[PDB]
């Protein structure tokens, strides 16, 4: 079935217990689903954010529009909206508990692949509508091949080995050089200063 | 403000100074590096076979025609056993020095088409070319002897 299957608004089984918005599901490098698995092309996230239902319809709709099913198949990597984001009633005063569940959402961290592509297709064919899709996303994303992915990871190794700067963020943060963990997160010892909030700095070694 | 925000949160000032001091510095070399120092053999075998084939050769500037007009020229020279050949001079300039044609090295440039032959209908080809007030006869070479257009009048006559 070489198309994007329908992604529902909310699963059949509901989630009756409300959840705290643990925004560290946006922060930092993703662990789940960073590499390809029987894919050749993807929409890599250069930053974290939340996917709604409407985003999933933008991707399913505007990909399955411009797609050759006899040449190209595609796979969701990001699951269905499962995080219940609540909103209080409009123009009502604070307190009185936590608001009712409004709509569900997926968290996507940086370095996540969202939609894998595959088949008898070159990269330059699929750059177009995956760049349109990659621009309609809430976070900064990019259409990435396999060779382009290993290309930019080898680039990041080149940056980490070429720099004539004696002072990196890793040497300063982990050694607590300038007494500087007073200003840093404890996550900044593992993010190593490439992540600020939900954003991602590719240019920063 | 939370730790994750929608806008890029303002850093603490020593956070920002750390980020500026630990920027990436690229290496600078002392000298800039930019300021330092099948079909081809098909044409070689094919046209090299055409070299040994022809006793007489001629050539023109056959770019100045239409498609059906080149079809008319193709049929009127199909009436003879002469052949016409549109091929790149890019490979033909090493062709001439291979075939020991030193008087033919200053001949083959720009738009040209070969008229390789063993039997001269080239007078009657001139009779076809006299009705069209263009497309001149460029000099040929029968049996390692060069033909000027005056030599085409003499030999063709």
């Amino acid at each position: 079935k070489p198309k994007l299957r329908f992604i529902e608004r909310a699963p059949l089984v509901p989630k009756v217990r409300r959840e705290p918005k643990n925004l560290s599901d946006i922060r930092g490098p993703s662990t789940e689903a960073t590499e390809f698995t029987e894919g050749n092309f993807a929409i890599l996230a250069l930053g974290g954010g939340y996917l709604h239902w409407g985003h999933f319809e933008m991707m399913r709709l505007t990909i399955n529009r411009s797609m050759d099913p006899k040449n190209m198949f595609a796979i969701w990597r990001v699951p269905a909206p499962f995080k219940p984001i609540t909103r209080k009633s409009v123009g009502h005063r604070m307190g009185g508990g936590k608001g009712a569940i409004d709509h569900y959402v997926t968290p996507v961290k940086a370095g996540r692949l969202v939609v894998e592509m595959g088949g008898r297709c070159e990269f330059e064919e699929v750059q177009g509508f995956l760049d349109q899709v990659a621009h309609k996303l809430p976070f900064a994303a990019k259409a990435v091949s396999r060779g382009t992915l290993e290309k930019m990871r080898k680039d990041q190794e080149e940056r980490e080995r070429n720099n004539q700067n004696p002072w990196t963020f890793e040497r300063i943060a982990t050694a607590n050089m300038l007494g500087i963990r007073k200003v840093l997160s404890p996550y900044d010892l593992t993010h190593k200063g490439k992540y600020w909030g939900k954003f991602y700095m590719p240019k920063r070694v | 403000s939370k730790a994750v925000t929608r806008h890029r949160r303002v850093m603490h000032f020593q956070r920002q100074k750390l980020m500026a001091v630990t920027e990436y510095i690229p290496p600078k070399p002392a000298i800039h590096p930019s300021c330092l120092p099948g079909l081809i053999r098909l044409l070689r075998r094919e046209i090299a076979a055409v070299f040994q084939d022809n006793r007489m050769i001629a050539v023109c500037q056959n770019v100045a025609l239409s498609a059906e007009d080149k079809l008319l020229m193709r049929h009127q020279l199909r009436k003879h056993k002469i052949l016409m050949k549109v091929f790149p001079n890019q490979v033909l300039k090493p062709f001439l020095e291979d075939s020991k044609y030193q008087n033919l090295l200053p001949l083959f440039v720009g738009h040209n088409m070969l008229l390789v032959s063993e039997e001269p209908k080239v007078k009657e080809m001139v009779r076809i070319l006299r009705t069209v007030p263009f497309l001149p006869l460029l000099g040929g070479c029968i049996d390692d002897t060069i033909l000027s257009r005056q030599g085409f009048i003499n030999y063709s006559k």
Binding site: S66, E122, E124, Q127, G128 | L39
Partner: peptide, 23 residues
């Protein structure tokens, strides 16, 4: 031969056609 490189040219033309879809 001749039809070998003609075939290679026709596959290159197909390739350029499949690349020039979105333009």
């Amino acid at each position: 031969s001749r039809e070998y490189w003609r075939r290679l040219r026709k596959q290159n033309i197909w390739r350029h056609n499949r690349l020039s879809k979105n333009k």
